[PDB]
């Protein structure tokens, strides 16, 4: 089998991307957050705090033939901007463009934090981290693709985000017209649960390439790309009057700026990132000060490949039984 499903920026800056989700029977249409830094698949549903339910489409797991409540079972996650959300568990059939899992774990919030109830664009999460992320306690279920391996053509899925513009994610097949050129695999680590590899390098618009290891996850469910504050700071020094800003909370820099391009290595292979890409816009309506799409890891603990990164590629997630990452230019 394979799905095929299109992706969509949910504001003008990319801030994150929803895919539409079928849940139950009859369906219920969710839009979520396709997330390869984390391994629940949640949604704001009928049991969700009603004062924290704010324009989002809720799953009524009654309302589904097919649901069954998964006994005993309860979960609660955090994510690296602080947010967080937990509940109760139900089971269910769940389709992503045309793909079918049933008895997947469907997790059902019972509270979600501010961040989530103030973005009515994002219904919730479907987790494509590896499952031994998982929340759901006393026992630990696995993630859409872990159930739908087995069943795919191939045992992969890949992301291809836009910028500005809709994607898609493919389950179980490589399309190879959606990129240029070849893809390059590289060796992952599932040791911390991610999609965890090690970049071969960097470079700064024109500069040269510095030859350098840079671990890391490939992470669709974070926005920006956070690198070392060593390579930060040599991006921020190629733009006039940039500055790391204590009380934005990162690297700001003139609105009037022509941002350089970004380089990273991916084996011998190069992805660059445009300039544009760099630009999160104005800090506050109005502010002629924007916001950097590259920041630092210090004080995160791990480098993060975030959307900044992905969407200037076609991304292999490759669950083979050895997995790996591969990268294309597109
Ligand atoms: O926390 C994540 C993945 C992530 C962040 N998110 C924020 C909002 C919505 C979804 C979502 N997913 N990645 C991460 C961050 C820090 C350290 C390790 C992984």
Same mark, same amino acid.
């Given at each position: 089998?394979?799905?095929?499903?299109?992706?969509?920026?949910?504001?003008?800056?990319?801030?994150?991307?929803?895919?539409?989700?079928?849940?139950?029977?009859?369906?219920?249409?969710?839009?979520?957050?396709?997330?390869?830094?984390?391994?629940?698949?949640?949604?704001?549903?009928?049991?969700?705090?009603?004062?924290?339910?704010?324009?989002?489409?809720?799953?009524?797991?009654?309302?589904?033939?097919?649901?069954?409540?998964?006994?005993?079972?309860?979960?609660?996650?955090?994510?690296?901007?602080? #947010? *967080? &959300?937990?509940?109760?568990?139900? $089971?269910?059939?769940?389709?992503? %463009?045309?793909?079918?899992? !049933?008895?997947?774990? @469907?997790?059902?919030?019972?509270?979600? #934090? *501010? &961040?989530?109830?103030?973005?009515? $664009?994002?219904?919730?999460?479907? %987790?494509?981290?590896?499952? !031994?992320?998982?929340? @759901?306690?006393?026992?630990?279920?696995?993630?859409?693709?872990?159930?739908?391996?087995?069943?795919?053509?191939?045992?992969?899925?890949?992301?291809?985000?836009?910028?500005?513009?809709?994607?898609?994610?493919?389950?179980?097949?490589?399309?190879?017209?959606?990129?240029?050129?070849?893809?390059?695999?590289?060796?992952?680590?599932?040791?911390?649960?991610?999609?965890?590899?090690?970049?071969?390098?960097?470079?700064?618009?024109?500069?040269?390439?510095?030859?350098?290891?840079?671990?890391?996850?490939?992470?669709?469910?974070?926005?920006?790309?956070?690198?070392?504050?060593?390579?930060?700071?040599?991006?921020?020094?190629?733009?006039?009057?940039?500055?790391?800003?204590?009380?934005?909370?990162?690297?700001?820099?003139?609105?009037?700026?022509?941002?350089?391009?970004?380089?990273?290595?991916?084996?011998?292979?190069?992805?660059?990132?445009?300039?544009?890409?760099?630009?999160?816009?104005?800090?506050?309506?109005?502010?002629?000060?924007?916001?950097?799409?590259?920041?630092?890891?210090?004080?995160?603990?791990?480098?993060?490949?975030?959307?900044?990164?992905?969407?200037?590629?076609?991304?292999?997630?490759?669950?083979?039984?050895?997995?790996?990452?591969?990268?294309?230019?597109?």
């Amino acid at each position: 089998s394979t799905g095929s499903a299109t992706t969509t920026p949910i504001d003008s800056l990319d801030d994150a991307y929803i895919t539409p989700v079928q849940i139950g029977t009859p369906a219920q249409t969710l839009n979520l957050d396709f997330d390869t830094g984390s391994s629940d698949l949640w949604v704001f549903s009928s049991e969700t705090t009603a004062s924290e339910v704010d324009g989002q489409t809720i799953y009524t797991p009654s309302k589904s033939t097919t649901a069954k409540l998964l006994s005993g079972a309860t979960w609660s996650i955090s994510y690296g901007d602080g #947010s *967080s &959300s937990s509940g109760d568990v139900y $089971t269910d059939t769940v389709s992503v %463009g045309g793909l079918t899992v !049933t008895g997947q774990a @469907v997790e059902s919030a019972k509270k979600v #934090s *501010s &961040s989530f109830t103030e973005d009515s $664009t994002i219904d919730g999460l479907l %987790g494509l981290a590896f499952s !031994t992320l998982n929340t @759901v306690s006393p026992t630990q279920q696995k993630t859409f693709f872990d159930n739908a391996k087995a069943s795919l053509d191939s045992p992969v899925f890949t992301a291809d985000l836009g910028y500005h513009a809709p994607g898609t994610y493919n389950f179980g097949f490589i399309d190879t017209t959606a990129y240029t050129g070849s893809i390059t695999y590289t060796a992952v680590s599932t040791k911390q649960g991610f999609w965890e590899w090690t970049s071969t390098g960097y470079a700064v618009g024109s500069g040269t390439f510095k030859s350098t290891s840079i671990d890391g996850i490939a992470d669709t469910g974070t926005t920006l790309l956070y690198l070392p504050a060593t390579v930060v700071s040599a991006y921020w020094a190629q733009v006039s009057g940039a500055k790391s800003s204590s009380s934005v909370g990162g690297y700001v820099f003139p609105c009037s700026a022509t941002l350089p391009s970004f380089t990273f290595g991916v084996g011998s292979a190069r992805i660059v990132i445009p300039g544009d890409y760099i630009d999160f816009g104005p800090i506050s309506t109005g502010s002629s000060s924007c916001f950097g799409g590259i920041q630092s890891s210090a004080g995160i603990g791990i480098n993060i490949f975030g959307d900044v990164a992905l969407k200037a590629a076609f991304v292999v997630f490759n669950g083979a039984t050895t997995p790996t990452l591969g990268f294309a230019s597109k």
